[PDB]
């Protein structure tokens, strides 16, 4: 935050409360849209009911959510049972204010973002780790080792790919040279759409987000049809609601971060509109991701570990070292564009054998 002002503390609290309730409404209506999009995928049609567009069905769902006998299971830790959903939700909500939805002052006067920390990706990384914390802790506290093992699979996989996220994020820091998102977005304003330079690492970022329960390990697990998952299966009324809420906020957080980091965070070459382009790119990534949700199989967490550990992460660090040589020697900025275009042609031509 070198060139950007600071809103008053009361204004920060106001924006925070607004972002949180907006994330609430957003995840409710995105549950609706995912239901209907999966429906359209499998030629059945969704709930033309309580809406018309269904937009009153989440109200009924929330009305069920409370009054649903929030139960404290025996053989469970009295404190962690209630505490773990709070952890998972608290450390899921935040890390979304940093995402710039417009140039400075475009919040009708004060600030598009909530906080614009000098070290942003590290804050994202830490609060992403604390989600896995909540996951495997709730798994333990449940007092059911069946669900515990699912919590352990979840934690292992999420942790491995969460490690890969660091090497994924290394590459653009060399070019932009700052750990604040606004400098990175402005660099994509000037030179243009960082993924053109770093498409491969972008990939290992994208797939990394698939491992964060988004989909296609899909042996996260959910309690269904496999070794039951952790962090649920013992919570009934509101805590289960908090688990699902935090998981979906994490999904949408990745769907929002992917364009912010590599592609064009709003900052368009054309029409330069603050919010609409970012929300539309969120919509694009969300639709492609639901396409993945519907259209692809599971991974069984063994091949998932193999693919993440042996393939994604060495590739990400190789690209990081390449970019580091190029940046420290600063020879062109063109070389990275050429190399990423060539690498994409490579990883593309090998498909249609």
């Amino acid at each position: 935050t070198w060139s950007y002002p600071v809103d008053p503390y009361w204004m920060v609290a106001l924006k925070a409360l607004l972002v949180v309730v907006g994330l609430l409404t957003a995840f409710a209506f995105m549950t609706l849209i995912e239901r209907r999009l999966l429906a359209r995928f499998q030629v059945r049609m969704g709930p033309n009911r309580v809406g018309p567009f269904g937009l009153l069905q989440p109200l009924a769902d929330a009305i069920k959510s409370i009054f649903k006998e929030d139960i404290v299971v025996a053989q469970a830790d009295r404190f962690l049972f209630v505490l773990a959903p709070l952890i998972s939700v608290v450390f899921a909500l935040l890390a979304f204010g940093l995402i710039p939805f417009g140039p400075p002052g475009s919040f009708f006067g004060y600030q598009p973002w909530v906080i614009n920390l000098d070290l942003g990706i590290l804050y994202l990384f830490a609060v992403s780790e604390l989600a896995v914390y909540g996951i495997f802790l709730s798994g333990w506290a449940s007092g059911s080792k069946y669900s515990l093992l699912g919590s352990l699979r979840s934690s292992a996989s999420l942790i491995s790919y969460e490690l890969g996220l660091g090497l994924a994020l290394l590459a653009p820091v060399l070019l932009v040279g700052s750990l604040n998102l606004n400098d990175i977005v402005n660099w994509q304003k000037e030179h243009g759409w960082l993924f053109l330079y770093a498409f491969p690492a972008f990939l290992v970022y994208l797939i990394a987000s698939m491992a964060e329960a988004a989909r296609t390990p899909f042996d996260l697990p959910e309690a269904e049809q496999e070794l039951v998952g952790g962090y649920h299966t013992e919570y009934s009324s509101i805590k289960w609601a908090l688990f699902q809420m935090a998981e979906y906020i994490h999904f949408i957080t990745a769907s929002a971060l992917i364009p912010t980091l590599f592609l064009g965070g709003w900052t368009m070459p054309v029409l330069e509109v603050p919010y609409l382009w970012m929300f539309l790119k969120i919509a694009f990534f969300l639709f492609f991701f639901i396409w993945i949700r519907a259209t692809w199989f599971r991974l069984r967490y063994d091949q998932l570990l193999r693919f993440g550990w042996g393939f994604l992460f060495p590739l990400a660090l190789l690209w990081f070292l390449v970019t580091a040589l190029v940046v420290a020697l600063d020879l062109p900025r063109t070389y990275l564009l050429y190399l990423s275009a060539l690498s994409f042609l490579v990883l593309l031509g090998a498909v249609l054998y």
């Binding site: 999009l37 995928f41 030629v43 059945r44 259209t295 692809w296 090998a350 054998y353």
Partner: protein, 180 residues
């Protein structure tokens, strides 16, 4: 075969943009075939005489023995059947009934014939024993349907349409293919 992931996505997309195939029950009437196995009906001759001579053959052909047929003796002045016998008490336990069609097959007077109504979900066991005056062709609807039409004031809307009624269902009034 990395191409197969993209092919799978492509086919899910083609089918995404193809909207139609589904039927929105109860807003759209389900198309039922004429030979469908539904709620029993008792048919009457054109004279108006009942066809059931209370011969308890429909109950024997029941693999659950779910049909109770108490017979009785016709009154010549104002008869109910064509012969000398009728069905004083004719009950079917819908919770015992398995909907074969063997009772329609064994009826020699064509009295018992399966219909088309399937909307007979109700709340109480003792309310799922359908009676004679709950199955006569002259009746319009199922038990909860008629009860809701009375406690509601709105006539019964059946959740089905058929291309026609079979000849075996002479008298049974039903929505026919769009003639109405």
């Amino acid at each position: 075969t990395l191409k197969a992931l993209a092919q799978s996505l492509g086919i899910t997309l083609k089918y995404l943009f193809s909207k139609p195939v589904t039927v929105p029950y109860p807003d759209a009437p389900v198309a039922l075939k004429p030979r469908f196995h539904g709620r029993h009906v008792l048919t009457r001759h054109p004279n108006g005489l009942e066809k059931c001579i209370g011969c308890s053959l429909c109950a024997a052909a029941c693999p659950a023995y779910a049909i109770y047929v108490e017979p009785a003796e016709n009154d010549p002045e104002n008869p109910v059947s064509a012969g000398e016998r009728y069905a004083k008490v004719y009950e079917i336990n819908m919770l015992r009934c398995i909907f074969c069609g063997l009772c329609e097959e064994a009826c020699p007077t064509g009295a018992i014939v399966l219909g088309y109504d399937f909307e007979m979900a109700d709340y109480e066991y003792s309310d799922l024993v359908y009676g004679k005056e709950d199955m006569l062709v002259d009746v319009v609807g199922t038990k909860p349907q008629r009860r809701e039409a009375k406690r509601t004031g709105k006539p019964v809307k059946v959740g089905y349409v058929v291309p026609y009624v079979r000849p075996e269902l002479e008298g049974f009034k039903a929505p026919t293919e769009g003639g109405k």
